[PDB]
Paper text:
In these experiments, bacterial proteins with different functions were investigated. Microcrystals of photoactive yellow protein (PYP), a blue-light photoreceptor from Halorhodospira halophila, were used to explore the capability of microsecond X-ray pulses. A nitrite-reducing enzyme, cytochrome c nitrite reductase (ccNiR) from Shewanella oneidensis, was exploited to investigate potential secondary radiation damage, caused by 90 µs pulses, at heme centers. Finally, a first TR-SSX experiment was performed on the photosensory core module (PCM) of a bacterial phytochrome from the nonphotosynthetic myxobacterium Stigmatella aurantiaca.
PYP is a small protein (14 kDa, 125 amino acids) that covalently binds p-coumaric acid (pCA) to a conserved cysteine residue via a thioester bond. We used both a fixed target and a tape drive to collect SSX data from PYP microcrystals on beamline ID29. The PYPPEG crystals belonged to space group P65. The PYPPEG crystals diffracted to higher resolution than the PYPMal crystals. PYP in space group P65 only forms four contacts between symmetry-related copies within 5 Å, while in space group P63 eight contacts are formed. Despite the denser packing of the P63 crystals, the crystals grown from PEG diffract to better resolution. Microcrystals suspended in viscous PEG are best used with fixed targets and tape drives, both of which were used in this study. The highly diffracting PYPPEG crystals were used for calibration and detector geometry refinement and for optimizing the key parameters for data collection from other proteins.
Author numbering: 1 to 125
The structure:
């Protein structure tokens, strides 16, 4: 297992150094998106939470296809403001309820170190 804590202030530095294998060792869900919301990476802990197979969701659009319950001002809207402003770093609670038992989570969205992709981090609450 990888020793990085959910919500660490340098989290994007640590994850920049990891391959696909190491992402699967995190204690929390990790999804990497491009500026359009297409899924670039999706780790095993996130599938454990949502029941999605990471190999099937990679390449799909998070907001249009995989997670329509996040297509809302409070989730997708904050993502789009962050992409546009170049500053994305926010934490909030949310409920995932599309094709799954309604599940309360804490979400941390943050821009990647290179500034051209974006992380969504998820843990149960
Ligand atoms: C509501 O539609 C949320 C869906 C969702 C969140 C996170 C995932 O990894 C997969 C689906």
């Amino acid at each position: 297992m990888e020793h990085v804590a959910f919500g660490s202030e340098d989290i994007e530095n640590t994850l920049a150094k990891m391959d696909d294998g190491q992402l699967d060792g995190l204690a929390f869900g990790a999804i990497q998106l491009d500026g359009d919301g297409n899924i670039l990476q999706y780790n095993a802990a996130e599938g454990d939470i949502t029941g999605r197979d990471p190999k099937q969701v990679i390449g799909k659009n998070f907001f249009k296809d995989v997670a329509p319950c996040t297509d809302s001002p409070e989730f997708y809207g904050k993502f789009k403001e962050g992409v546009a402003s170049g500053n994305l770093n926010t934490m909030f609670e949310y409920t995932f309820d599309y094709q799954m038992t309604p599940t309360k989570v804490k979400v941390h969205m943050k821009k990647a170190l290179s500034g051209d992709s974006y992380w969504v981090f998820v843990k149960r609450v």
